[PDB]
Design a protein around this ligand. Structure first.
Ligand SMILES: O=[N+]([O-])c1ccc2nn[nH]c2c1
Length: 299
């Protein structure tokens, strides 16, 4: 049974998965995505290292493949993070002039978003912008541009594609008493009051065993920032306990503004932490107990 169809029947938008070209041509990933998932996200092909490895010169082959595949198969598409610090090409991190870096950041956002204008439901515009204590992470963008880089990024994105839902995303937002969770709420509320077009908060949910229960309190707290949408992104759970996965799904169901959930791959051996077997399909592409528990919970 399709968890995407079942979550749509409960009033949500999608159950999604991260993938890319070489996943779609190997294993059983294409067949499982066709049957069971409603949105695809690029595992790597839209990050800055993959798309603009030298200035103004864009690499679109991998991203184009994914977008085409999704359109041919009737799937929604999420757009990978436009502005973050992870694996940034060195040409970006060596810029020290505020005007130049602002122009570079705007060009990167506008070029990607324009290419797929109208085809992408939601873009992760800024990612991983917070330290664990809730202060802003001192990346090249913060150091050179200042804290206005976040408003500028969102305003530029809204102009490039008004159809898309624009998200800020971060990890370790899984507990309502952790400082980072309240800090992103505080800042998103302030940005929205200033008219910054942040449509969503995306929670990059990488859980250890037993941490699913806390999402039932953290996700409503994230929703108190007043964004139109929230989502659960990049989900994986060490051990893949049914209890943990069902708790995350029910957090989504309980929060009216939570539009959907995306899991961080199809089958355990293709996870970035495969030794924790944290996904919904095993190494033979069989649905694991957590998959069936989600099916029953949604019924
Ligand atoms: O939800 N996702 O699995 C996901 C995967 C890669 C991404 N890059 N940016 N946002 C992302 C979300």
């Amino acid at each position: 049974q399709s968890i995407d169809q079942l979550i749509k029947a409960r009033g949500k938008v999608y159950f999604g998965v991260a993938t890319d070209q070489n996943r779609l041509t190997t294993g059983k990933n294409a067949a499982i995505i066709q049957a069971d998932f409603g949105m695809v996200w690029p595992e790597n092909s839209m990050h800055w290292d993959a798309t603009e490895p030298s200035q103004g010169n864009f690499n679109f082959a991998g991203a184009d493949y994914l977008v085409n595949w999704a359109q041919q198969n009737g799937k929604l598409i999420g757009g990978g993070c436009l502005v973050w610090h992870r694996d940034l090409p060195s040409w970006v991190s060596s810029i020290t002039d505020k005007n130049t870096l602002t122009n570079v950041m705007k060009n990167h956002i506008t070029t990607l978003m324009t290419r797929y204008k109208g085809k992408i439901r939601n873009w992760d515009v800024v990612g991983e912008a917070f330290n664990e204590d809730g202060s802003l992470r001192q990346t090249v963008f913060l150091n050179v541009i200042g804290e206005d880089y976040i408003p500028i990024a969102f305003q530029t994105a809204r102009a490039a594609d008004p159809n898309a839902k624009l998200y800020i995303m971060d990890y370790n937002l899984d507990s309502a008493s952790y400082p980072k969770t309240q800090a992103i709420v505080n800042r998103v509320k302030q940005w929205r009051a200033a008219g910054v077009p942040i449509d969503g908060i995306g929670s990059q949910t990488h859980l250890s065993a037993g941490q699913g229960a806390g999402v039932l309190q953290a996700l409503p707290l994230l929703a108190s920032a007043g964004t139109p949408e929230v989502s659960i992104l990049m989900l994986d759970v060490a051990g893949a306990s049914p209890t943990d996965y069902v708790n995350v799904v029910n957090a989504c169901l309980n929060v009216q503004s939570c539009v959907g959930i995306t899991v961080f791959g199809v089958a355990d051996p293709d996870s970035w932490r495969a030794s924790t077997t944290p996904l919904l399909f095993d190494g033979n592409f069989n649905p694991k107990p957590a998959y069936n528990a989600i099916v029953q919970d949604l019924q």
